[PDB]
Symmetry: C4
Subunit: 387 residues, 4 copies
Amino acid sequence: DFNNLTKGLCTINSWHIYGKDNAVRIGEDSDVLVTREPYVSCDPDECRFYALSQGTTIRGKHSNGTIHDRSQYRALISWPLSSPPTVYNSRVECIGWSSTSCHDGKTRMSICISGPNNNASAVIWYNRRPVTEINTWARNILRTQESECVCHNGVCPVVFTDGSATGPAETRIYYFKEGKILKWEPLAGTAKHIEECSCYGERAEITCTCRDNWQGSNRPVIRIDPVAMTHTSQYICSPVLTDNPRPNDPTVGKCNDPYPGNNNNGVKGFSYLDGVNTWLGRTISIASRSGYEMLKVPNALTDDKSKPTQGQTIVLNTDWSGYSGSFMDYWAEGECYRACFYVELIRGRPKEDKVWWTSNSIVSMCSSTEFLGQWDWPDGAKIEYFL
Amino acid sequence: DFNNLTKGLCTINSWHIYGKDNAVRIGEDSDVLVTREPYVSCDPDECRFYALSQGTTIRGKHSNGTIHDRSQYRALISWPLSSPPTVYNSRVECIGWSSTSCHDGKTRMSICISGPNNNASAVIWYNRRPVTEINTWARNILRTQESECVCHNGVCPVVFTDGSATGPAETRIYYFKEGKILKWEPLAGTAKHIEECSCYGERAEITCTCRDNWQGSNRPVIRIDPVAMTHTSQYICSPVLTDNPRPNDPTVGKCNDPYPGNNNNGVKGFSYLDGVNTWLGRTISIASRSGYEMLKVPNALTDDKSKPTQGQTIVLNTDWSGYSGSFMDYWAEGECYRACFYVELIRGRPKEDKVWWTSNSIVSMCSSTEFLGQWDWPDGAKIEYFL
Amino acid sequence: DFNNLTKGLCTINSWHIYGKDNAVRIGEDSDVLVTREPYVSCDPDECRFYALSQGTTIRGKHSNGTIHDRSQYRALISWPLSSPPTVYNSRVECIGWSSTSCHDGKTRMSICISGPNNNASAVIWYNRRPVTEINTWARNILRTQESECVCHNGVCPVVFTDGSATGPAETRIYYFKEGKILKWEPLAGTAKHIEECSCYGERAEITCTCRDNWQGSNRPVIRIDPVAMTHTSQYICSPVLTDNPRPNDPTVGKCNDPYPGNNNNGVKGFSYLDGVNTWLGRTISIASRSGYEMLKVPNALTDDKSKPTQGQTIVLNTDWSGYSGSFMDYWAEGECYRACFYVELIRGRPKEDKVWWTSNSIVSMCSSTEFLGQWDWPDGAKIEYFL
Amino acid sequence: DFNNLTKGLCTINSWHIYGKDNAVRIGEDSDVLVTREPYVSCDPDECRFYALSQGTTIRGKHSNGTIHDRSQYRALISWPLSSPPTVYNSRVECIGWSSTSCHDGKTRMSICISGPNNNASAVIWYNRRPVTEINTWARNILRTQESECVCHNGVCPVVFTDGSATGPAETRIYYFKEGKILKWEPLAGTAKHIEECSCYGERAEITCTCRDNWQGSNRPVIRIDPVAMTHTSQYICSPVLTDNPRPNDPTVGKCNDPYPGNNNNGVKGFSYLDGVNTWLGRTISIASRSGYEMLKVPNALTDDKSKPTQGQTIVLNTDWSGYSGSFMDYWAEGECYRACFYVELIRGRPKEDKVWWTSNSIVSMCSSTEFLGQWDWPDGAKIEYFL
Ligand SMILES: COC(=O)[C@@H]1C[C@H](C(=O)O)O[C@H]1[C@H](CC(C)C)NC(C)=O
Ligand SMILES: COC(=O)[C@@H]1C[C@H](C(=O)O)O[C@H]1[C@H](CC(C)C)NC(C)=O
Ligand SMILES: COC(=O)[C@@H]1C[C@H](C(=O)O)O[C@H]1[C@H](CC(C)C)NC(C)=O
Ligand SMILES: COC(=O)[C@@H]1C[C@H](C(=O)O)O[C@H]1[C@H](CC(C)C)NC(C)=O
């Protein structure tokens, strides 16, 4: 049967290490594919790492220029937890340069979009075979979440966006079931721009924390109802701004508008909005994608004045970070859903340009009800060795 | 039970990306085997890429001279969809330099022919064990389809050819069932020469579009009946000639004779003859194997005057193409058979001779009922990196 | 159902070769991960090699400095028996720099501890998903056995230690069941210091032979009761001292105190205390970790005067050895539990410093009731080839 | 249930290609292990290649000196049919420098012998776990078949030899069942010396064709009865001598004595003694291990004057050959047992000494009832590329 979001989030008193692949370190001497936009996603019997390959190894020569986001050589691949996406272990889910993937409890739905900027198309795969296609509707880079979607009794919502990435665009929430479109609706609510949504589900409710790439430094939130196939948007009120770049933390935030200071930019990110048990993610730097932390910000979603009451350093401020998304092993044993997340430790261009490539590692963690000590999880590689 | 061709072809209003392995790109730095004559074929629980290995990696030194078609080091290998045929992932189906393979719904039948030009032999494997052998009957390079065959209630027809490749030869249609020969018949119909057939089945009918290597630029078609174990040959009337090389498109074509202009040459190819829902494949160039397109030519099979009413670019005219064959996931969910095909993106010799090898990548697509945007799918490699 | 320790140890009249991976030899030309602290552990349907990867290949450049014990790039990996821990075959059980792992008959429990020296945390995984966490309690390198634990009717005891490694510390015996803590107790008995325990079970009794890293050269023994969840500590009376370094063998040993001569040092080790059928392991050298032997010392556990009555050379005195732990295929056929053990053949730093790395191979053997001839099992590699 | 030899041999009117791995070619650029003494053996659901690894890749530096037969780094490995024994695909069955392996229909029994020349020991594994050990009985290199054994209703006979390899020695026929010794008997019959036996079974009878390494150029035959656990020895009467080196073919051969001309040497080999349907194998050269042929010698086993009535070239006289053994897919479909065999194409030392290694490829073929054309199957590699 299809998995149903019947549990709530477990209490998050800290975060324990869940997974790390050290792909860039290892890939300096093994056949590791170049990637970006990774994520983690579970099936009923296993969890795996996911990402968009560049169709080349890091040590390979075609790794030169992998700083590019959309090429015909990209594809969503998945592989064994905490292992490196290698040419021999990676499994191609589908071909494209933007994806999302989730398991409905019975089987998996993976979606890859591919094509030219002005005329791309998305293909929904279910049970490893293509079932539905969706053509661009705004003709300007059709794109999806870049992280696991969430299903409920067969329904798996997926947030898409088509149009400008620096002004109003056409965002849509699609409701699929066995790869077939049951219904889709345009973005409603007060969020003024939706990009790469990070989602999670619990108690029949799916919460996606995305990124306002044009005006907000205070990421938008899209709360979805998988049963009524309806949703709503907004922002995280809290003054603890979580995008990047982003102006410094104010004392009050905006709930239904983008908090200004930075335009036309940002980084995929996530959060766990669950009352007092609410945790946020943010790069530590406000200027670039470096260092990453988790901060317990009670009621951030609604308390336009909320500040951290606890936190945890994930990646030091002197180490490279990047994309961060949420996933949960919905098939795990227990009375609740252990909240997990991943951080993308980008290496290479643009920041480290003595190499011609751009790749990343992965570090993943899940919540603990204990109050555990922390450690920073760097990619670990030495660009020097790559010169 | 054995799968039965009980559906018709789905409407083809466009073509979506199905698979791509970027083997030559990746193989520049990983252990990827040298190949040619690839194809795609599905089982009830998965689909895979297939090809004739050269028994050597691309970066390997024995890759030197892999421009040769028949050596004792060749063999039909299959591997995971959209992955590169590597030394560690490729599975040897059988040994030979010409094959065909299909699944009857219960298990798979793969056939490899091997041996000296004047005295080769074919071996039919069923359920991964050899069952039947067939010796040359014309003593001049025994050869098969080079792409998936099609079964119906246990019967899987396979088109063979023995004799000259530049004049009359002995072509036969064999009817196997569990690897055993039930019956074989000589080529009947008006087709004057049959080489490397591309087939597909629907509504108890198997249609193979082959290539008249000696006189036709307008590929022959062999329509087979798996129940009555009888067939018939002809050509595609349409003036939209689909072989290569080939003279320019006339206004009227030949239905029961080879359309002249080019002799003793051509390229394996496919087509989907289904009334108005009829689609053709052809290299874009008329001189060499470069660029590839799909064109909706209603009734091409019977309308000796038919012209394109719609089309789609698969590979740009400035990129290398090659062999193209048809396959369909006959075990997919749905009311019809989604038509798919693959294009072989040959790299190396003879066209690109600064390297001593000849290999290829793979790009595969299946039909969509939507009207999707297009993108060209190049191999992606840079021979420069290989020097 | 959960496996139950219902058999006794088979008679040990000699030791036959069980497993060897020649990872350092092979890894000189293949992608083999750098490791340390290996072990062997069985499931109901297979046995595998285990170890703490360094997140890098031996030939890789990040192998430089792998002499370090705790980094964020370490992780417990398992792979196919007698094969080398490669980047493509190794499976990540969990992330950390100290582990233990056992199967309760139904599924496996693996534990990895990770973090900064002054504030680490342990994570218990059961059935491949995290279930329980345990924070440092003495704030000075939380650590576990470094070898397989043993379960009984669902209960799997694990010996931990936190605090100084050169003076009194806090050792605890935890009793888990399906990853959940049922109960834990502090170290009782007369053992004055517990480090890296090697355990085995038979007839409802679990016996762990650990290492007194601060004062004893005569390793301590912790006998555990999985049903009553109670234990007891002591030392091996025998004068045949089995740690390293260690003073020369006296005529009488200590039963309830550390036998002096060497302080603040040692090597993980094991033993089989079973009446007259009692066998010990020890490096042959008394100065460093080189050469390894097995010696039948009847009643060593209680006979403060016992001497060898038989023995077997495992690794010559002129070859590098290291850690040694016990495991038994508790799911094997037969009336008893064939005692097995592994020896870690460390290569590289500190002893062989012309290379910048530190890795190891593995050699494993199990007891025979026959009286078999012996052979020494060297790592086999040549550091010269690595320069 | 256990497989039972209930069929007879199919008629052998020719031989078709079954398997080839091109390991040395491929291994010039991929991580292929160095091996010798290969063979092929089937289980109820698959067939695989087997051999004794050298614990190193061909391109690896430890490949230097792999000309040696017994080292502590050797081990019996098995892998996917027609693929190369790679570091990532090879599976270690057991550790040793002499093996044999067969499947009784329920599970597999593999045996590896290891140790010093004057005091080795054999370990019998059943269902992948060690069960029985057997110590040397003549104290001079304990050794087995080097090719698949044959079982009947649970009983799997294995021919061993201990003592001189150039004079009388102690050969024994062991009868195992689930790895346990049921009974063993010393070599009886008129064969004066037994080494590396090649066996096959049909109609409750197991026939092993071995090699008289001290006096015979006309290989001995040991016919075994798996039910009565009794056997008998002899030689192949035929004057078509099949060992190597060997004097030229006489007109009459010896039935119960070694045919003289060459002493203290030979090559593992096989044959199919089945009345008129009797086929022999022999290197084509009489001086070294080069070229290989199959010859239909009716009644060779009993007709001390029999000459070839038909034959087939397997490997040309100008290509390297070596060991040859028999195997049959006893679980194949059909009314008879298709006779198969493998030839070891040794490369490197001693013949080709510009390299410091010694490895091999594999070529395998099975009988056809057809009269198929032939082709020679060379290893394919170019030692030049290895310099
Ligand atoms: C696959 O490429 C990415 O994820 C790129 C990576 C890049 C980044 O932020 O580093 O922006 C993503 C881009 C987002 C817009 C908002 C700039 N999405 C697509 C589909 O092009
Ligand atoms: C395996 O080799 C091929 O597929 C070769 C490849 C070559 C080509 O067209 O590029 O012709 C094929 C040849 C066809 C005749 C018509 C020239 N078939 C065989 C079995 O030799
Ligand atoms: C993973 O690291 C090890 O096993 C190290 C290896 C090192 C050795 O003896 O070679 O000591 C272990 C150390 C033990 C104390 C007693 C010195 N344990 C930890 C968790 O740091
Ligand atoms: C594993 O080594 C072999 O197979 C060696 C290979 C060598 C050969 O003939 O090339 O002789 C085998 C030798 C046979 C005696 C009769 C010389 N057997 C053992 C166990 O040492």
